[PDB]
Structure 1
């Protein structure tokens, strides 16, 4: 559950992220595949080499989903219904994997925002990713 402040931090920092969102999502994915090879078993048909166009393309998609989430922070289950169906009903992604991508997304964030990744923003973005993760790993249809 996000606090009023949490929402303010997540919106502010993601605003800061701005146009670099797709890149960051791509980098997050890459860090995940390299750091936790197991996660690769979910993208068999993907070219997971450094800089591949598929990973970058998928990152944009991931970032757009998150930007969408940020924009409907108070109504995520509804806004992410289709994505939840995909990760929870169909792909049946183990939630441990969401902790891993989230962590990688924070790491990427820390690596790109030396001036804005404050402790509070870090805390708020952590809870935010946890909330998105819960929606996507839950079958509520």
Structure 2
């Protein structure tokens, strides 16, 4: 994939200020609420039946940070994300079994969250370059679903 330089500052920037322990729990917890089918795997995490019992699940807290950091490498491996995410994908596919449509649904939960944290700072601009990075990881994230 291609990559402007301004796609690179904004994206680079976006991991400078990004609150990892703030938005991390705020986006997986947000995933399992707007798209509760995503709780399909996390079934052992404890109570998740109703909304704030999900915002009240520490495991999702934890993991949501996991997830967040999991896009770290990609920022490093921008021109090699697929080769870089190849084994993540394969993991989620054969061991985990996660339906790859959900990957794309968490992204929009990650996006959105960042959106209220950056407020007037998450411009069209930044949304463009931000999405145009998660939409590559996800890809790679799916690339080994055979």
Q: TM-score, normalised by structure 1?
A: 0.87
State which of 53, 56, 64 in structure 1 corresponds to 2:69.
Answer: 64
Q: 1:97-122, CA deviations, whole angstroms, 9 ceiling, x for partnerless residues?
A: 12210100111011111142111100
Corresponding pairs, count: 139
- In 1, the alpha carbon distance for the partners of 2:21 and 2:132 equals 21
The runs of at least 4 consecutive aligned structure 1 residues that moved more than 6 Å come to none
Which residues of structure 2 form unaligned runs of 5+?
A: none
Consecutive unaligned residues of structure 1, counting only runs of 5 or more, are none
Give the alignment's Cα RMSD to 1 decimal. 1.9
The two structures have a TM-score, normalised by structure 2, of 0.84
Higher RCO, Cα 8 Å, sep 6+: 1
Indicate the residue corresponding to 2:24 in structure 1.
25
Question: Matches of 1:22 and 1:131 in 2, distance apart?
Answer: 23
1:73–1:14 Cα change, 3 Å: same
Instruction: Give 2:10's aligned residue.
Output: 9
